[PDB]
Design a protein around this nucleic acid. Structure first.
Length: 114
DNA sequence: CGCGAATATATATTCGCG
DNA sequence: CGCGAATATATATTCGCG
């Protein structure tokens, strides 16, 4: 249902796909991540995941740098405050997805005949 | 005309093949 | 050492929305 993705894009200042990257990070709870591994877990292509990581890093969700032993590959870093920020977002987004499903159900229940 | 997404082209580095 | 592919990054064009 695209209306729910539009609601998340509008209200959370991040896309549903950007939210799925944070869900991936929130399930794994590692200190650092590879962008090729984000692509391996979420099949959006290289420029889409780089745009997602550029938006999310500017929104403070993770730190972003080229690797310490190789100057092309990336390290996406997650501090303890960022882990709490991500878990709090997942709680808020699941609650708001529940509210969005409930108002949809109330709009459908208006068809009370037949 | 202007914003943003899909797509192609170009920059920079490290890797694998030769 | 040199060519080409893969990684992350960034710019520009064509298309759809506004």
């Amino acid at each position: 249902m695209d209306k729910l993705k539009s609601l998340i894009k509008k209200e959370f200042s991040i896309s549903f796909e950007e939210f799925a990257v944070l869900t991936y990070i929130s399930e794994n709870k590692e200190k650092e991540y590879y962008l090729k591994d984000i692509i391996n877990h979420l099949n959006y292509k290289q420029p889409q995941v780089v745009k997602a990581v550029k938006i999310l890093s500017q929104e403070d969700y993770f730190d972003k740098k080229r690797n310490e032993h190789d100057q092309r590959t990336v390290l996406i870093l997650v501090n303890a405050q960022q882990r709490k920020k991500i878990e709090s977002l997942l709680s808020r987004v699941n609650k708001r997805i529940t509210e969005a499903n409930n108002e949809i159900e109330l709009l459908e229940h208006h068809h009370h005949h037949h």
